[PDB]
Design a protein around this ligand. Structure first.
Ligand SMILES: [Cl-]
Ligand SMILES: [Zn+2]
Length: 258
C-alpha cells in the first residue's frame, strides 16, 4: 500500500514509489566530525522567531506537525549558508521506540533519542508548494534531543498530544513560542540534502546544530503513545519514524566552527 515505517512499507521500500530515494543528495547522513570542513566564510545563523504565530498541531500519520502562519515574514531564518529569507511553516520530530535510537542524522555514528526539524521555505518562491521544486527551496534546522533533564519549553506540546492521538486529528495550538526549543549555541554543520520522508525531494539546505537539547524520559514517553493508525483501526504505536543514514556520495559537510 502507501509508504510508512512498518516492515512492508518502510524506508527500504520507498524507492519503488519514489525513485528519487536512490538519488544523489538524499538525507539523512552520518556526520563525520573529523572530515567536516570548517568554512570561515559561513556567516552566523540569524533566527528571528519573536513574531511567530503558531496555528495548529496535527497528526498526519507519520509524525505530528505544529503549523505556523507563513503569510508574512513573522518567523524567519537567514544568514548561515543561506541566500535570502526563509519562512518557518512547521516543525515536527522523529523519535524511536527506545532512548538509544530515534534521530535521523547521526554524529560519528552516534544516534540520539529524537530529532527536531524546523522547516522553512525560500520566500523568493512565493509558497511552500513552489519552493519544494527548487534546489534551494527549503532550509531545515535540525536539533538533536537527548534524554536527561526536562525541557520546560516542550511541555506545552507534550500535554496536547492526548487530543491528536490518531491519524488525521488536529487541534488548535496558538501562542507557542518555538524559541523555547533552541539550544544555547547555534554552531552548526550544513550540507545539501532532501526531505527525509516521501516525496523525498532534494530541495533542502540542512543546518544541523552541534548542541543537543535535553528532554526528560517522561516527555519522550508521551511521543511514543501516539498512533500511526486512524481512529477505529488496529492500534499501531507511532515509534521509530526515522530513516536510516544515506550515502554522502558527492557531497561535503561544512562546519561553522572549528
Ligand atoms: Cl523531514
Ligand atoms: Zn523531518
Amino acid at each position: 500500500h502507501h509508504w510508512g515505517y512498518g516492515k512492508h512499507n518502510g524506508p527500504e521500500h520507498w524507492h519503488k514509489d519514489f525513485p528519487i530515494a536512490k538519488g544523489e543528495r538524499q538525507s539523512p547522513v552520518d556526520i563525520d566530525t573529523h572530515t567536516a570542513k570548517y568554512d570561515p566564510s559561513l556567516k552566523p545563523l540569524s533566527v528571528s522567531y519573536d513574531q511567530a504565530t503558531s496555528l495548529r498541531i496535527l497528526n498526519n500519520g507519520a509524525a505530528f506537525n505544529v503549523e505556523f502562519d507563513d503569510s508574512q515574514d513573522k518567523a524567519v531564518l537567514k544568514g548561515g549558508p543561506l541566500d535570502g529569507t526563509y519562512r518557518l511553516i512547521q516543525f515536527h520530530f522523529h523519535w524511536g521506540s527506545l532512548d538509544g535510537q530515534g534521530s535521523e542524522h547521526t554524529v560519528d555514528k552516534k544516534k540520539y533519542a529524537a530529532e527536531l526539524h524546523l522547516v522553512h521555505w525560500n520566500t523568493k518562491y512565493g509558497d511552500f508548494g513552489k519552493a519544494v521544486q527548487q534546489p534551494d527551496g527549503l532550509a531545515v534546522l535540525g536539533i538533536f534531543l537527548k534524554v536527561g533533564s526536562a525541557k520546560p519549553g516542550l511541555q506545552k506540546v507534550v500535554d496536547v498530544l492526548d487530543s491528536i492521538k490518531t491519524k488525521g486529528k488536529s487541534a488548535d495550538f496558538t501562542n507557542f513560542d518555538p524559541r523555547g526549543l533552541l539550544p544555547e549555541s547555534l554552531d552548526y554543520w550544513t550540507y545539501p540534502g532532501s526531505l527525509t520522508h516521501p516525496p523525498l525531494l532534494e530541495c533542502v539546505t540542512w543546518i544541523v546544530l552541534k548542541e543537543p537539547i535535553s528532554v526528560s524520559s517522561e516527555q519522550v514517553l508521551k511521543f511514543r503513545k501516539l498512533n500511526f493508525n486512524g481512529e477505529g483501526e488496529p492500534e499501531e504505536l507511532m515509534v521509530d519514524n526515522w530513516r536510516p543514514a544515506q550515502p554522502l556520495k558527492n557531497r561535503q559537510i561544512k562546519a561553522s566552527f572549528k
